Design a protein around this ligand. Structure first.
Ligand SMILES: NCCNc1ncnc2c1ncn2[C@@H]1O[C@H](COCC#Cc2nc3c(N)ncnc3n2[C@@H]2O[C@H](CO)[C@@H](O)[C@H]2O)[C@@H](O)[C@H]1O
Ligand SMILES: NCCNc1ncnc2c1ncn2[C@@H]1O[C@H](COCC#Cc2nc3c(N)ncnc3n2[C@@H]2O[C@H](CO)[C@@H](O)[C@H]2O)[C@@H](O)[C@H]1O
Ligand SMILES: NCCNc1ncnc2c1ncn2[C@@H]1O[C@H](COCC#Cc2nc3c(N)ncnc3n2[C@@H]2O[C@H](CO)[C@@H](O)[C@H]2O)[C@@H](O)[C@H]1O
Ligand SMILES: NCCNc1ncnc2c1ncn2[C@@H]1O[C@H](COCC#Cc2nc3c(N)ncnc3n2[C@@H]2O[C@H](CO)[C@@H](O)[C@H]2O)[C@@H](O)[C@H]1O
Lengths: 261, 261, 261, 261
């Protein structure tokens, strides 16, 4: 099929990219970065996140592959030594696909702007104090005040959700996880403290109380939104599709990254 | 249908039980605690847990109801003032049922003994140090050492999973959650630290390293097992069925219990 | 002696201020906000922090007083109903003084700029990733990467140190506490995780690795410092002096603020 | 002076002990385990804790030494390769001494029994639910309910206090730290959550509410006390004295044990 390859930009990733292109030149494979069918990321998870968001509008027609030229990643989880065997098996095709859930973020102004996240989306305050009303399925749940909130995808739970105390969820679970950032709790102010895991079709809505300006991040893109009326989180109907050529369990990927490898 | 009622034993729960029986006497309802179809628990979640385990072998033929004579519970979530309206609506029938997942615990000796848990099951050490090899889907994940482990159901996440830092999961998610109890982490000893959420059909196996005696709890029953070879956790194929007569969202039940009511 | 009074600015605090001035007019008390001897803060802890930093260069010649027109504060810990009894006892004098330790922050450029903090001082990253080398008494302790670090005074432990998992220290302990903000820990990256409590004369030094621009906060003043070479934390030789007219134990102040009042 | 040596019991520690005795035979050094002046522990921190409690009644006349035949310990912090240089420098004497604070535990019945702890002392429940009234300096602070409480010494903060979220305190700080074990917090039950650091002369008192039987641990000795009326914690007036022959900072000892060595 059609294919393209992104690279971290350093010398190791660029040269491995040119070697896979040359290996792809030995099959009916056409290099195309406009409407590709196979996107190969060479670098870390950050390079993979850039590859995802570069083609987020054709997710249902693309199978992603991750090659880590540095330490093992959760999305770039194949060694550079396996590039040649990767080229052939991708060349024949007939591979199976695995799908991970995505997080849809909707931001309303006083105008709507939606986003898709592979890791997570965070809300923080532009300078001053951060206070939100957290509304779950139109039911007011709590008035949060602290440094911010993080809504994570299943595969994003090992990223930044994890540093905030959140649990690690297997990516086959269609859900999203919300974690707190330095919440203040006293007799007057009250948050749940525990992380929350929401299923599909559950809508978590963040609504402002005083300041209406928020620093909103979606994966690695962070933009200050002004005059914000609402932030809506829910598990997306779209999914990201990986091409699998070997067996690499998520919990094994967790073991190698955090226990020892 | 046939029905029975358990009571916490105090005077308030016993008298409310006799008043519901008298109200049930005004319909074709037969009191039977051998093969009931409706089990009504009057008390707290502890009384409800006793009611569940009393009829754990007929779970697919029973719809449970919880009435809290004290503070609001997550299973006993209906006020005593709503007992009369409860008797009639249960009398007519035609109610809908909601189902929560359960945790199957398997304990092997050198002999097998399986259990069902509505909240969680915990493993701790009989006196000395607690060390386990944690095996996920036959893959060795970590060597845990500390005070113990807790494997929680979705509706058990607000119980004791919560005190151990675990996340709160909506009970519609067929999953189980594992939390650590005072794990020691240094250069020599390494645990994941984060809680783990496992989907259906995933098998978490605990295996001993030195001591083979463990204090194993399943909800509120705690028994010391000797000569233990393995402890297997997985989401059960059985589910507990509640009869619902009103709308009481889980997140609303979480709000009232931990934020304010 | 000479005295001045700051006010939160709202109508309740301004009018209580004019009533204490009128009550002070009935004694030999001279209102002076240039070289006062008694600084009375009317408002919350935020108003008290502004009062502290307004007179941080004459700390050894001032006894502070806090009056909370809203909820109880840890520095503004006297009810407005006790203002009249406060005016007289401050008028006679002969009060005893209590002293809390302070945190000295030193920031070096490529030039030095020192600060004093009553609550804490935090280091965060200007936009991009936050990586630091943490050096304790010239010994390299760890390479921190995450959202930031917080170095807290004893009386600042109930503030923002507390939201970050830190312990609450009695203000008689001459020490400082360091807490982490969303540290990432894997096989490759390693932080201590636990909060650290340092005694007097111990010097904690933060040193950059890549980015040399940091958002540095000292209590409520937050300023982006550019071209930063080092950030040095240590317990200050200066102390803040409170005038005490009653008995209000710190742990009682903790109980009323976080347990119930 | 007089000296004795304890050993972990394995072959490596026993033979290193006989080699130090033979090396001590080359000086005026008399082996005496009744009234020694130098206690040398060969093993881990556990062997050192046994050595401490073996001579807890002559602490002001003993300087302890720790040799780790396994991984580095916080009390056994000298390599076996440094045993010969250790024998000579201990033989000459003229060494300096460092002192760490200790925790005094007082247990009253309905009779008093006091203990000394080098790491910590914990209170847990004999089977059933664990509820305590926590009283600080005769002021009731909170009603704790959960799995237990841990009161730690400064040098015990890296032990088991650390697994419970507590902070690490430099051992020059005369203080004690209290951490919670799986506390339950809802609208009805309320604990501080944060760890508490108490100075000298502060008295933390645990008092029962229903069950009067508690599993009380002091370092590695754990005994079930029946008919308990009170448990009193406070920094002891006694201190443990180490002989120092090199420079080994506590924070360096923390770095090697938890970061990397
Ligand atoms: N207001 C607070 C400011 N703080 C932050 N602001 C914004 N983002 C943040 C913040 N603090 C962490 N992040 C995480 O960085 C990602 C940036 O994109 C690159 C990546 C990645 C990645 N993805 C995963 C994954 N899925 N699982 C496991 N490790 C993963 N990583 C690892 O993160 C490191 C690089 O970041 C490397 O070790 C990668 O191996 C964000 O998506 C977020 O997850
Ligand atoms: N080795 C460590 C020893 N420690 C422990 N050993 C054993 N069990 C423990 C331990 N520490 C907590 N527990 C929890 O007690 C349950 C006992 O059964 C009664 C109950 C309950 C209950 N269930 C829920 C729920 N589903 N959601 C939310 N609150 C719930 N509660 C509340 O718990 C309190 C009573 O316990 C009351 O406030 C109830 O409102 C166990 O199932 C376990 O969850
Ligand atoms: N990069 C992360 C961005 N996040 C933050 N950036 C900057 N500061 C922050 C941040 N998140 C919390 N803070 C804290 O706010 C203080 C601001 O000054 C006002 C105050 C106060 C105060 N002082 C105490 C005290 N000593 N003990 C107990 N409560 C106290 N408060 C209470 O804080 C609330 C107001 O803040 C009120 O409830 C007060 O009762 C800072 O000094 C810091 O402690
Ligand atoms: N109801 C709950 C049941 N749980 C527990 N019950 C009782 N004790 C417990 C429990 N869980 C941990 N402990 C700790 O074990 C100590 C036992 O004595 C041996 C030791 C030690 C030691 N001391 C230190 C130190 N000062 N600093 C840093 N590491 C240290 N260790 C390390 O602990 C490991 C051995 O334990 C080894 O890695 C040692 O390197 C107790 O004093 C307590 O600290």
């Amino acid at each position: 099929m059609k294919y393209m390859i992104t690279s971290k930009g350093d010398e190791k990733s660029d040269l491995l990219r040119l070697n896979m292109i040359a290996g792809f030149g030995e099959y009916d494979m056409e290099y195309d970065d406009v409407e590709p069918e196979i996107v190969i990321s060479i670098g870390g998870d950050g390079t993979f996140l850039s590859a995802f968001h570069q083609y987020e509008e054709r997710l249902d027609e693309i199978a992603f592959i991750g090659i880590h030229t540095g330490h093992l990643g959760f999305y770039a989880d194949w060694r550079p030594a396996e590039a040649d065997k990767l080229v052939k098996l991708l060349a024949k095709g007939e591979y199976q696909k695995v799908s991970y859930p995505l997080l849809k973020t909707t931001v309303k102004y006083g105008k709507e702007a939606t986003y898709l996240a592979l890791n997570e989306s965070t809300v923080k305050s532009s300078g001053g104090p951060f206070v939100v009303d957290v509304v779950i399925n139109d039911i007011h749940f709590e008035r949060f005040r602290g440094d911010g909130l993080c809504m994570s995808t299943p595969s994003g739970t090992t990223a930044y959700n994890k540093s905030l105390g959140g649990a690690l969820m297997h990516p086959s679970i269609e859900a999203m996880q919300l974690t707190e950032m330095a919440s203040i709790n006293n007799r007057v102010y009250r948050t749940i403290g525990s992380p929350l895991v929401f299923p599909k079709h559950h809508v978590v809505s963040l609504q402002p109380v005083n300041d209406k300006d928020f620093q909103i991040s979606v994966d690695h893109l962070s933009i200050l939104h002004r005059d914000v009326q609402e932030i809506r989180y829910e598990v997306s109907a779209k999914k990201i599709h990986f091409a699998r050529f070997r067996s690499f369990p998520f919990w094994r990927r967790v073991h190698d990254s955090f226990i020892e490898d």
